[PDB]
Protein backbone atom coordinates (compact mmCIF):
# COMPACT_ATOMS: atom_id res chain seq x y z
CA UNK A 1 0.00 0.00 0.00
CA UNK A 2 3.45 1.29 -0.11
CA UNK A 3 0.80 3.58 0.95
CA UNK A 4 -0.07 6.47 -1.23
CA UNK A 5 -3.24 6.42 0.88
CA UNK A 6 -1.96 9.13 3.26
CA UNK A 7 -3.70 12.42 3.97
CA UNK A 8 -2.14 15.84 4.21
CA UNK A 9 -1.71 17.34 7.68
CA UNK A 10 -1.31 21.08 8.14
CA UNK A 11 1.80 21.77 10.12
CA UNK A 12 2.08 25.36 9.01
CA UNK A 13 2.92 27.93 11.71
CA UNK A 14 3.96 31.54 12.09
CA UNK A 15 7.12 32.07 13.83
CA UNK A 16 8.32 35.54 14.89
CA UNK A 17 11.97 34.94 15.21
CA UNK A 18 15.17 36.90 15.41
CA UNK A 19 18.85 36.34 15.84
CA UNK A 20 22.50 37.29 15.54
CA UNK A 21 24.82 38.11 12.59
CA UNK A 22 27.58 35.67 11.89
CA UNK A 23 25.88 32.86 13.74
CA UNK A 24 23.80 29.96 12.45
CA UNK A 25 20.49 29.76 14.25
CA UNK A 26 17.76 27.14 13.75
CA UNK A 27 14.44 28.72 12.63
CA UNK A 28 11.91 25.88 13.01
CA UNK A 29 12.08 22.06 13.35
CA UNK A 30 9.24 19.79 12.25
CA UNK A 31 9.59 16.22 13.36
CA UNK A 32 8.89 13.98 10.46
CA UNK A 33 7.77 10.35 10.66
CA UNK A 34 8.86 7.76 8.09
CA UNK A 35 7.17 7.98 4.72
CA UNK A 36 5.97 11.55 4.80
CA UNK A 37 6.69 13.72 1.71
CA UNK A 38 7.05 16.93 3.99
CA UNK A 39 6.55 20.06 1.89
CA UNK A 40 7.41 23.66 2.97
CA UNK A 41 6.88 27.21 1.76
CA UNK A 42 8.34 29.91 3.90
CA UNK A 43 7.54 33.55 3.32
CA UNK A 44 8.41 36.49 5.52
CA UNK A 45 10.59 39.59 6.00
CA UNK A 46 14.16 40.06 7.12
CA UNK A 47 15.29 43.20 8.85
CA UNK A 48 18.29 44.71 10.61
CA UNK A 49 17.84 46.78 13.67
CA UNK A 50 17.73 50.47 12.84
CA UNK A 51 21.21 51.32 11.54
CA UNK A 52 23.04 54.47 12.68
CA UNK A 53 23.66 55.98 9.25
CA UNK A 54 22.02 55.59 5.87
CA UNK A 55 22.18 52.36 4.05
CA UNK A 56 25.70 51.48 2.94
CA UNK A 57 26.09 47.76 2.32
CA UNK A 58 23.70 44.86 2.15
CA UNK A 59 23.96 41.45 3.73
CA UNK A 60 23.62 38.03 2.21
CA UNK A 61 21.00 35.97 3.99
CA UNK A 62 21.23 32.19 3.47
CA UNK A 63 18.32 30.16 4.77
CA UNK A 64 18.82 26.32 4.74
CA UNK A 65 16.86 23.05 5.67
CA UNK A 66 18.34 19.69 6.31
CA UNK A 67 17.14 16.19 6.92
CA UNK A 68 18.61 14.47 9.95
CA UNK A 69 17.39 10.95 10.44
CA UNK A 70 17.17 9.90 14.05
CA UNK A 71 19.31 6.93 13.13
CA UNK A 72 22.41 9.13 12.71
CA UNK A 73 21.90 10.31 16.19
CA UNK A 74 20.89 7.40 18.41
CA UNK A 75 22.75 4.80 16.43
CA UNK A 76 21.60 1.29 17.11
CA UNK A 77 19.88 2.57 20.21
CA UNK A 78 17.34 3.53 17.62
CA UNK A 79 17.52 0.26 15.82
CA UNK A 80 16.71 -1.55 19.03
CA UNK A 81 14.17 1.16 19.81
CA UNK A 82 12.15 0.40 16.74
CA UNK A 83 12.60 -3.34 16.77
CA UNK A 84 11.73 -3.40 20.50
CA UNK A 85 8.68 -1.32 20.18
CA UNK A 86 6.51 -0.43 23.08
CA UNK A 87 9.17 -1.96 25.29
CA UNK A 88 12.12 0.16 24.47
CA UNK A 89 13.94 2.33 26.88
CA UNK A 90 12.84 5.94 26.26
CA UNK A 91 15.74 7.56 24.33
CA UNK A 92 18.25 9.97 25.96
CA UNK A 93 17.79 13.61 26.71
CA UNK A 94 20.58 16.07 26.92
CA UNK A 95 20.89 18.78 29.64
CA UNK A 96 20.77 22.61 29.26
CA UNK A 97 22.04 25.56 31.36
CA UNK A 98 19.04 26.84 33.26
CA UNK A 99 18.09 30.02 31.48
CA UNK A 100 14.86 30.64 29.48
CA UNK A 101 16.90 31.70 26.64
CA UNK A 102 19.69 29.16 25.89
CA UNK A 103 18.21 26.43 23.81
CA UNK A 104 17.80 29.39 21.47
CA UNK A 105 20.08 27.81 18.93
CA UNK A 106 17.68 24.90 18.56
CA UNK A 107 14.61 27.01 18.05
CA UNK A 108 12.83 26.16 21.33
CA UNK A 109 12.40 27.82 24.60
CA UNK A 110 14.35 25.71 27.03
CA UNK A 111 11.82 23.58 28.79
CA UNK A 112 11.42 24.02 32.52
CA UNK A 113 13.37 20.90 33.23
CA UNK A 114 16.48 21.84 31.38
CA UNK A 115 16.15 18.86 29.01
CA UNK A 116 16.01 18.65 25.25
CA UNK A 117 15.93 15.39 23.38
CA UNK A 118 19.28 14.36 21.93
CA UNK A 119 18.18 14.53 18.34
CA UNK A 120 17.55 18.24 18.49
CA UNK A 121 20.98 18.95 19.78
CA UNK A 122 23.03 16.36 18.06
CA UNK A 123 21.49 17.38 14.80
CA UNK A 124 22.69 20.91 14.98
CA UNK A 125 26.12 19.66 15.82
CA UNK A 126 25.99 17.03 13.12
CA UNK A 127 25.21 19.93 10.81
CA UNK A 128 27.60 22.61 11.84
CA UNK A 129 30.37 20.10 11.62
CA UNK A 130 29.46 18.96 8.13
CA UNK A 131 28.29 22.03 6.26
CA UNK A 132 29.71 25.18 7.99
CA UNK A 133 33.11 25.30 9.74
CA UNK A 134 36.06 24.80 7.51
CA UNK A 135 36.93 21.21 6.86
CA UNK A 136 40.21 21.85 8.66
CA UNK A 137 38.56 23.23 11.80
CA UNK A 138 38.07 20.56 14.45
CA UNK A 139 34.78 18.80 14.93
CA UNK A 140 32.77 20.27 17.65
CA UNK A 141 32.31 17.54 20.20
CA UNK A 142 29.99 18.57 22.94
CA UNK A 143 27.78 16.45 25.08
CA UNK A 144 25.14 18.75 26.40
CA UNK A 145 24.42 22.43 25.91
CA UNK A 146 25.81 22.80 29.41
CA UNK A 147 29.06 23.10 27.65
CA UNK A 148 28.22 26.17 25.57
CA UNK A 149 28.81 29.95 25.83
CA UNK A 150 26.08 32.45 26.61
CA UNK A 151 27.02 33.81 23.22
CA UNK A 152 27.11 30.38 21.60
CA UNK A 153 23.85 29.17 22.93
CA UNK A 154 21.45 32.15 23.38
CA UNK A 155 22.27 32.98 19.76
CA UNK A 156 23.56 30.42 17.28
CA UNK A 157 27.20 29.26 16.90
CA UNK A 158 29.60 31.23 14.68
CA UNK A 159 30.25 30.40 11.07
CA UNK A 160 32.90 31.35 8.56
CA UNK A 161 33.18 34.59 6.66
CA UNK A 162 32.73 34.74 2.97
CA UNK A 163 35.38 33.14 0.84
CA UNK A 164 38.32 35.37 0.02
CA UNK A 165 42.20 35.26 0.14
CA UNK A 166 42.59 35.64 3.93
CA UNK A 167 39.48 33.75 4.98
CA UNK A 168 39.78 30.71 2.75
CA UNK A 169 43.45 29.87 2.67
CA UNK A 170 44.75 26.45 1.77
CA UNK A 171 44.49 24.06 4.69
CA UNK A 172 47.31 24.91 7.04
CA UNK A 173 48.50 21.39 6.74
CA UNK A 174 49.07 21.49 2.98
CA UNK A 175 52.58 20.18 2.32
CA UNK A 176 55.17 22.48 0.90
CA UNK A 177 57.58 19.60 0.32
CA UNK A 178 57.72 15.81 0.28
CA UNK A 179 61.03 14.25 1.07
CA UNK A 180 62.13 10.80 -0.13
CA UNK A 181 64.64 8.87 1.93
CA UNK A 182 67.56 8.57 -0.54
CA UNK A 183 70.83 6.87 0.32
CA UNK A 184 74.05 8.97 0.18
CA UNK A 185 75.32 8.56 -3.38
CA UNK A 186 72.32 6.82 -5.05
CA UNK A 187 68.61 7.16 -5.65
CA UNK A 188 66.41 4.20 -6.41
CA UNK A 189 64.93 5.30 -9.73
CA UNK A 190 62.04 2.85 -9.23
CA UNK A 191 61.56 4.17 -5.75
CA UNK A 192 61.07 7.73 -6.95
CA UNK A 193 58.18 6.65 -9.08
CA UNK A 194 56.37 4.89 -6.30
CA UNK A 195 56.99 8.02 -4.28
CA UNK A 196 55.14 10.19 -6.68
CA UNK A 197 52.31 7.72 -6.88
CA UNK A 198 51.91 7.99 -3.15
CA UNK A 199 51.73 11.76 -3.57
CA UNK A 200 49.18 11.79 -6.26
CA UNK A 201 46.92 9.49 -4.28
CA UNK A 202 47.37 11.53 -1.10
CA UNK A 203 46.87 14.80 -2.94
CA UNK A 204 43.55 13.90 -4.61
CA UNK A 205 42.42 12.00 -1.50
CA UNK A 206 42.90 15.07 0.68
CA UNK A 207 40.98 17.33 -1.58
CA UNK A 208 39.17 15.01 -3.84
CA UNK A 209 37.54 12.47 -1.59
CA UNK A 210 37.25 12.36 2.13
CA UNK A 211 34.32 10.12 2.72
CA UNK A 212 34.16 6.33 2.73
CA UNK A 213 31.55 6.62 0.00
CA UNK A 214 34.15 8.29 -2.13
CA UNK A 215 36.79 5.71 -1.83
CA UNK A 216 34.61 2.99 -3.04
CA UNK A 217 33.25 5.06 -5.85
CA UNK A 218 36.80 5.42 -7.05
CA UNK A 219 36.89 1.71 -7.57
CA UNK A 220 33.62 2.05 -9.43
CA UNK A 221 31.44 0.43 -6.88
CA UNK A 222 28.70 1.70 -4.68
CA UNK A 223 27.74 1.43 -1.06
CA UNK A 224 25.10 3.02 1.09
CA UNK A 225 27.28 3.61 4.13
CA UNK A 226 25.29 5.98 6.25
CA UNK A 227 27.46 6.18 9.32
CA UNK A 228 29.43 9.09 8.05
CA UNK A 229 26.25 10.74 9.45
CA UNK A 230 26.17 13.57 6.89
CA UNK A 231 22.76 15.26 7.05
CA UNK A 232 21.03 15.98 3.71
CA UNK A 233 20.78 19.40 2.15
CA UNK A 234 17.21 19.33 0.80
CA UNK A 235 16.94 22.93 -0.23
CA UNK A 236 18.94 26.09 0.59
CA UNK A 237 18.19 29.59 -0.79
CA UNK A 238 20.14 32.86 -0.75
CA UNK A 239 19.04 36.56 -0.75
CA UNK A 240 20.84 39.83 -0.49
CA UNK A 241 18.73 41.84 1.99
CA UNK A 242 18.29 45.57 1.39
CA UNK A 243 16.10 48.62 0.86
CA UNK A 244 14.87 51.94 2.32
CA UNK A 245 16.48 54.82 4.13
CA UNK A 246 14.17 57.19 6.08
CA UNK A 247 15.12 60.75 5.24
CA UNK A 248 14.92 62.83 8.41
CA UNK A 249 12.81 66.00 8.55
CA UNK A 250 13.32 68.24 11.59
CA UNK A 251 15.76 71.10 12.00
CA UNK A 252 18.73 69.31 13.53
CA UNK A 253 18.71 66.58 11.00
CA UNK A 254 17.39 66.74 7.46
CA UNK A 255 20.71 65.35 6.17
CA UNK A 256 20.43 62.55 8.75
CA UNK A 257 19.09 59.14 7.74
CA UNK A 258 18.66 55.68 9.23
CA UNK A 259 18.49 52.54 7.19
CA UNK A 260 15.39 50.44 7.58
CA UNK A 261 16.08 47.09 5.82
CA UNK A 262 13.18 44.90 4.70
CA UNK A 263 13.73 42.33 1.97
CA UNK A 264 10.88 39.89 1.91
CA UNK A 265 11.84 36.31 1.12
CA UNK A 266 10.30 33.03 0.08
CA UNK A 267 12.23 29.94 0.82
CA UNK A 268 10.60 26.81 -0.47
CA UNK A 269 11.25 23.16 -0.23
CA UNK A 270 9.45 20.84 -2.64
CA UNK A 271 7.83 17.51 -1.77
CA UNK A 272 10.70 15.53 -0.17
CA UNK A 273 10.23 11.82 0.57
CA UNK A 274 11.27 11.01 4.16
CA UNK A 275 13.00 7.60 4.29
CA UNK A 276 12.83 7.00 8.05
CA UNK A 277 11.62 8.86 11.10
CA UNK A 278 13.70 11.94 11.75
CA UNK A 279 13.88 15.69 12.42
CA UNK A 280 13.95 18.39 9.73
CA UNK A 281 15.98 21.52 10.64
CA UNK A 282 15.84 24.66 8.62
CA UNK A 283 18.39 27.25 10.01
CA UNK A 284 19.28 30.77 8.80
CA UNK A 285 22.50 32.74 8.67
CA UNK A 286 23.15 36.39 7.92
CA UNK A 287 26.54 37.73 6.95
CA UNK A 288 27.77 41.08 5.81
CA UNK A 289 30.50 40.52 3.35
CA UNK A 290 33.96 41.32 4.63
CA UNK A 291 35.48 44.57 3.38
CA UNK A 292 38.34 46.08 5.23
CA UNK A 293 39.19 49.59 5.93
CA UNK A 294 42.66 48.20 5.63
CA UNK A 295 43.05 45.48 3.01
CA UNK A 296 45.62 46.05 0.28
CA UNK A 297 46.36 44.23 -2.95
CA UNK A 298 49.21 41.76 -2.48
CA UNK A 299 51.18 43.18 -5.37
CA UNK A 300 51.09 46.63 -3.79
CA UNK A 301 52.04 45.61 -0.32
CA UNK A 302 54.45 42.73 -0.67
CA UNK A 303 57.28 45.03 -1.55
CA UNK A 304 59.80 44.62 -4.35
CA UNK A 305 58.02 42.68 -7.02
CA UNK A 306 59.98 39.75 -8.50
CA UNK A 307 59.50 37.71 -11.64
CA UNK A 308 57.39 34.96 -10.19
CA UNK A 309 54.94 37.60 -8.90
CA UNK A 310 54.11 39.60 -11.98
CA UNK A 311 55.00 37.20 -14.72
CA UNK A 312 51.90 35.11 -14.37
CA UNK A 313 54.23 32.62 -16.05
CA UNK A 314 51.89 29.60 -15.78
CA UNK A 315 54.87 27.29 -15.74
CA UNK A 316 56.00 28.51 -12.32
CA UNK A 317 52.58 29.08 -10.90
CA UNK A 318 51.95 25.66 -12.22
CA UNK A 319 54.85 23.90 -10.65
CA UNK A 320 55.29 25.63 -7.36
CA UNK A 321 53.85 24.64 -4.05
CA UNK A 322 51.84 27.18 -2.04
CA UNK A 323 53.57 30.26 -0.66
CA UNK A 324 53.20 31.46 2.93
CA UNK A 325 51.84 35.03 3.08
CA UNK A 326 51.38 37.06 6.25
CA UNK A 327 48.52 39.21 7.21
CA UNK A 328 50.97 42.12 6.83
CA UNK A 329 51.32 41.25 3.19
CA UNK A 330 47.62 41.90 2.84
CA UNK A 331 46.59 44.38 5.46
CA UNK A 332 47.90 47.62 6.71
CA UNK A 333 48.75 47.01 10.34
CA UNK A 334 48.44 43.27 9.87
CA UNK A 335 50.54 40.79 11.88
CA UNK A 336 53.51 39.33 10.06
CA UNK A 337 53.99 36.59 12.58
CA UNK A 338 50.76 35.07 11.54
CA UNK A 339 50.98 33.46 8.13
CA UNK A 340 48.74 31.37 5.88
CA UNK A 341 49.48 29.22 2.86
CA UNK A 342 48.00 30.44 -0.43
CA UNK A 343 48.06 28.75 -3.89
CA UNK A 344 50.66 30.50 -6.08
CA UNK A 345 48.97 33.18 -8.10
CA UNK A 346 45.89 34.02 -6.07
CA UNK A 347 46.80 37.64 -6.57
CA UNK A 348 45.70 37.24 -10.16
CA UNK A 349 42.63 35.33 -9.20
CA UNK A 350 41.13 37.70 -6.67
CA UNK A 351 40.74 41.40 -6.13
CA UNK A 352 40.25 43.24 -2.77
CA UNK A 353 37.39 45.66 -2.10
CA UNK A 354 38.85 49.01 -1.34
CA UNK A 355 37.16 51.10 1.26
CA UNK A 356 38.62 54.55 1.00
CA UNK A 357 40.27 55.65 4.18
CA UNK A 358 37.68 58.38 4.85
CA UNK A 359 35.49 55.85 6.49
CA UNK A 360 37.89 54.20 8.82
CA UNK A 361 37.14 55.98 12.09
CA UNK A 362 33.53 56.72 11.20
CA UNK A 363 30.80 54.98 13.14
CA UNK A 364 27.98 53.37 11.23
CA UNK A 365 29.64 51.19 8.57
CA UNK A 366 29.47 47.44 8.72
CA UNK A 367 32.96 47.15 7.36
CA UNK A 368 35.50 45.32 9.44
CA UNK A 369 37.78 48.08 10.75
CA UNK A 370 41.12 46.34 11.48
CA UNK A 371 42.45 42.98 10.36
CA UNK A 372 41.54 40.20 12.66
CA UNK A 373 44.26 38.62 14.82
CA UNK A 374 44.48 35.14 16.08
CA UNK A 375 45.00 31.83 14.54
CA UNK A 376 43.27 31.01 11.25
CA UNK A 377 39.96 30.08 12.84
CA UNK A 378 39.70 32.96 15.12
CA UNK A 379 40.40 34.85 11.95
CA UNK A 380 37.95 33.05 9.80
CA UNK A 381 35.03 32.77 12.17
CA UNK A 382 32.88 35.83 12.42
CA UNK A 383 32.94 38.03 15.54
CA UNK A 384 29.33 38.83 15.96
CA UNK A 385 30.34 41.92 17.88
CA UNK A 386 31.83 44.45 15.49
CA UNK A 387 28.45 45.22 14.14
CA UNK A 388 26.95 46.60 17.26
CA UNK A 389 28.44 49.88 16.08
CA UNK A 390 25.88 50.26 13.37
CA UNK A 391 22.70 49.75 15.25
CA UNK A 392 20.77 51.69 17.84
CA UNK A 393 19.16 48.98 19.80
CA UNK A 394 20.52 45.50 19.95
CA UNK A 395 17.42 44.65 22.01
CA UNK A 396 16.09 42.48 19.21
CA UNK A 397 19.65 41.52 18.45
CA UNK A 398 20.89 42.33 14.97
CA UNK A 399 18.15 40.87 12.79
CA UNK A 400 14.37 40.62 13.18
CA UNK A 401 12.16 38.50 10.94
CA UNK A 402 8.48 38.05 10.99
CA UNK A 403 7.87 34.79 9.16
CA UNK A 404 5.06 32.53 8.27
CA UNK A 405 5.88 28.84 7.63
CA UNK A 406 3.58 27.08 5.24
CA UNK A 407 4.17 23.43 5.84
CA UNK A 408 1.94 20.59 4.75
CA UNK A 409 3.10 17.06 5.24
CA UNK A 410 1.30 14.09 3.91
CA UNK A 411 1.60 11.35 6.55
CA UNK A 412 -0.87 8.71 7.46
CA UNK A 413 -1.94 9.16 10.95
CA UNK A 414 -5.50 8.12 11.57
CA UNK A 415 -8.50 10.46 12.09
CA UNK A 416 -9.88 12.16 15.13
CA UNK A 417 -12.18 9.08 15.16
CA UNK A 418 -10.81 7.30 17.99
Amino acid sequence: QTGAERMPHDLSHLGFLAGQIGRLITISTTPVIAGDSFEMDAVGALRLSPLRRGLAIDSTVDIFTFYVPHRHVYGEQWIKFMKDGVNATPLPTVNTTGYIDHAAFLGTINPDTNKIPKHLFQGYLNIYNNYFKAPWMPDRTEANPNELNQDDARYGFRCCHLKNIWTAPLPPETELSRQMTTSTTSIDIMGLQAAYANLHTDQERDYFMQRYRDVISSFGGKTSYDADNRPLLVMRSNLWASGYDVDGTDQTSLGQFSGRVQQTYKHSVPRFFVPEHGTMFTLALVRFPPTATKEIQYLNAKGALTYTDIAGDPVLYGNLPPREISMKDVFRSGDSSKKFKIAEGQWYRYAPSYVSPAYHLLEGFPFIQEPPSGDLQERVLIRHHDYDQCFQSVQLLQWNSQVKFNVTVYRNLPTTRD
Partner: protein, 175 residues
Amino acid sequence: MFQTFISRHNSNFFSDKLVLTSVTPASSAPVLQTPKATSSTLYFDSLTVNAGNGGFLHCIQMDTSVNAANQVVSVGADIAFDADPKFFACLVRFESSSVPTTLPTAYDVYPLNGRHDGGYYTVKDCVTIDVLPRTPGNNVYVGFMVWSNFTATKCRGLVSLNQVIKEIICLQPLK
Protein backbone atom coordinates in the same frame (compact mmCIF):
# COMPACT_ATOMS: atom_id res chain seq x y z
CA MET B 1 -1.46 75.57 23.99
CA PHE B 2 -0.43 72.03 23.40
CA GLN B 3 0.54 70.00 26.39
CA THR B 4 4.11 68.83 26.75
CA PHE B 5 4.40 65.07 26.88
CA ILE B 6 8.05 64.66 27.35
CA SER B 7 10.04 64.96 30.55
CA ARG B 8 13.58 64.30 31.65
CA HIS B 9 12.55 62.05 34.47
CA ASN B 10 9.63 59.87 35.31
CA SER B 11 8.97 58.90 38.84
CA ASN B 12 7.62 55.71 40.19
CA PHE B 13 3.95 55.82 41.06
CA PHE B 14 4.86 54.55 44.53
CA SER B 15 7.10 56.56 46.92
CA ASP B 16 8.94 55.21 49.99
CA LYS B 17 9.42 56.77 53.38
CA LEU B 18 13.02 56.84 54.59
CA VAL B 19 12.99 54.68 57.64
CA LEU B 20 16.37 55.87 58.96
CA THR B 21 16.71 59.13 60.85
CA SER B 22 20.35 60.12 60.92
CA VAL B 23 23.22 59.93 58.55
CA THR B 24 26.76 60.67 59.19
CA PRO B 25 28.40 62.04 56.03
CA ALA B 26 31.53 60.12 55.28
CA SER B 27 34.13 59.14 52.78
CA SER B 28 32.36 55.81 52.66
CA ALA B 29 29.13 57.54 51.97
CA PRO B 30 26.32 55.57 53.49
CA VAL B 31 23.42 54.36 51.45
CA LEU B 32 20.29 55.99 52.96
CA GLN B 33 18.13 52.87 52.44
CA THR B 34 18.60 49.45 50.81
CA PRO B 35 18.59 49.71 47.05
CA LYS B 36 15.46 48.80 45.20
CA ALA B 37 15.26 47.40 41.68
CA THR B 38 14.87 49.87 38.88
CA SER B 39 13.13 52.90 40.16
CA SER B 40 12.17 54.30 43.52
CA THR B 41 11.31 57.63 45.00
CA LEU B 42 12.49 58.17 48.58
CA TYR B 43 11.16 60.97 50.78
CA PHE B 44 12.19 62.13 54.24
CA ASP B 45 10.74 64.96 56.30
CA SER B 46 13.51 65.01 58.90
CA LEU B 47 16.89 63.56 58.31
CA THR B 48 19.51 64.66 60.79
CA VAL B 49 22.86 65.08 59.12
CA ASN B 50 25.61 64.71 61.61
CA ALA B 51 28.82 66.50 61.24
CA GLY B 52 31.22 64.85 58.87
CA ASN B 53 33.27 65.21 55.77
CA GLY B 54 31.92 63.14 52.90
CA GLY B 55 28.50 62.34 51.56
CA PHE B 56 25.38 60.23 51.74
CA LEU B 57 23.52 58.84 48.67
CA HIS B 58 20.38 57.10 47.40
CA CYS B 59 20.46 53.88 45.33
CA ILE B 60 18.61 52.17 42.53
CA GLN B 61 19.99 48.87 41.17
CA MET B 62 20.53 48.67 37.41
CA ASP B 63 18.30 45.88 36.14
CA THR B 64 20.74 44.35 33.82
CA SER B 65 18.32 42.18 31.91
CA VAL B 66 17.82 43.89 28.55
CA ASN B 67 20.63 43.59 26.07
CA ALA B 68 21.82 47.17 25.90
CA ALA B 69 24.93 48.45 27.51
CA ASN B 70 24.23 52.15 27.73
CA GLN B 71 20.89 53.16 29.29
CA VAL B 72 19.44 56.45 30.54
CA VAL B 73 19.15 57.03 34.33
CA SER B 74 17.17 60.00 35.66
CA VAL B 75 17.04 61.38 39.25
CA GLY B 76 14.66 64.15 40.22
CA ALA B 77 14.93 65.63 43.70
CA ASP B 78 14.09 68.61 45.86
CA ILE B 79 16.04 68.76 49.10
CA ALA B 80 16.24 71.48 51.69
CA PHE B 81 18.86 71.65 54.46
CA ASP B 82 18.33 73.84 57.52
CA ALA B 83 21.78 75.30 57.01
CA ASP B 84 23.85 75.98 53.93
CA PRO B 85 26.44 73.24 53.71
CA LYS B 86 27.97 74.38 50.45
CA PHE B 87 27.80 70.89 48.98
CA PHE B 88 28.03 69.62 45.49
CA ALA B 89 25.67 67.03 44.13
CA CYS B 90 26.14 64.47 41.39
CA LEU B 91 24.92 61.08 40.18
CA VAL B 92 27.22 58.19 41.17
CA ARG B 93 27.80 54.81 39.67
CA PHE B 94 29.50 52.17 41.78
CA GLU B 95 29.21 48.46 41.55
CA SER B 96 29.30 45.85 44.24
CA SER B 97 28.83 42.13 44.59
CA SER B 98 26.62 42.60 47.56
CA VAL B 99 23.90 44.75 48.93
CA PRO B 100 25.75 47.98 49.52
CA THR B 101 25.52 50.11 52.63
CA THR B 102 28.31 52.45 51.66
CA LEU B 103 29.76 53.89 48.49
CA PRO B 104 32.71 51.67 47.85
CA THR B 105 36.19 52.67 46.98
CA ALA B 106 35.80 52.85 43.27
CA TYR B 107 32.94 54.90 41.98
CA ASP B 108 32.25 57.37 39.20
CA VAL B 109 30.64 60.74 39.24
CA TYR B 110 28.63 62.65 36.58
CA PRO B 111 27.39 66.28 36.63
CA LEU B 112 23.68 67.06 36.94
CA ASN B 113 22.04 70.30 35.83
CA GLY B 114 20.25 71.25 38.96
CA ARG B 115 20.06 74.51 40.75
CA HIS B 116 21.44 75.40 44.16
CA ASP B 117 20.22 78.16 46.43
CA GLY B 118 21.74 78.18 49.80
CA GLY B 119 20.34 75.20 51.65
CA TYR B 120 18.16 74.21 48.76
CA TYR B 121 18.63 71.97 45.75
CA THR B 122 16.21 70.86 43.05
CA VAL B 123 16.95 68.81 39.95
CA LYS B 124 15.35 66.68 37.24
CA ASP B 125 17.94 65.77 34.59
CA CYS B 126 19.12 62.46 33.16
CA VAL B 127 22.44 60.89 32.26
CA THR B 128 23.57 57.87 30.29
CA ILE B 129 25.57 55.44 32.42
CA ASP B 130 26.84 52.08 31.27
CA VAL B 131 24.50 49.85 33.23
CA LEU B 132 26.16 46.55 32.60
CA PRO B 133 28.74 45.52 35.24
CA ARG B 134 32.40 46.37 34.59
CA THR B 135 33.45 43.42 36.65
CA PRO B 136 31.84 39.98 36.42
CA GLY B 137 30.38 39.33 39.85
CA ASN B 138 28.84 42.69 40.47
CA ASN B 139 25.62 44.48 40.24
CA VAL B 140 25.87 48.07 39.23
CA TYR B 141 24.17 50.84 41.13
CA VAL B 142 23.39 54.50 40.29
CA GLY B 143 22.33 57.08 42.84
CA PHE B 144 22.09 60.76 43.74
CA MET B 145 24.79 61.89 46.11
CA VAL B 146 25.32 65.15 48.01
CA TRP B 147 28.78 65.60 49.48
CA SER B 148 30.52 68.25 51.54
CA ASN B 149 32.23 68.92 54.81
CA PHE B 150 29.05 68.67 56.85
CA THR B 151 28.13 70.37 60.08
CA ALA B 152 25.31 68.91 62.03
CA THR B 153 21.98 69.99 60.54
CA LYS B 154 18.82 68.51 59.12
CA CYS B 155 17.22 68.25 55.74
CA ARG B 156 13.81 67.53 54.27
CA GLY B 157 12.79 66.43 50.81
CA LEU B 158 12.59 63.59 48.33
CA VAL B 159 14.93 62.11 45.79
CA SER B 160 13.66 59.69 43.14
CA LEU B 161 15.59 57.74 40.46
CA ASN B 162 14.51 55.72 37.47
CA GLN B 163 16.40 53.69 34.88
CA VAL B 164 15.02 54.12 31.36
CA ILE B 165 14.72 50.52 30.43
CA LYS B 166 11.10 50.90 29.22
CA GLU B 167 8.74 53.73 28.44
CA ILE B 168 5.61 54.66 30.36
CA ILE B 169 2.44 55.74 28.65
CA CYS B 170 0.11 58.64 29.19
CA LEU B 171 -3.18 59.80 27.83
CA GLN B 172 -2.67 61.95 24.73
CA PRO B 173 -6.31 62.80 24.16
CA LEU B 174 -5.61 63.68 20.60
CA LYS B 175 -5.15 60.01 19.71
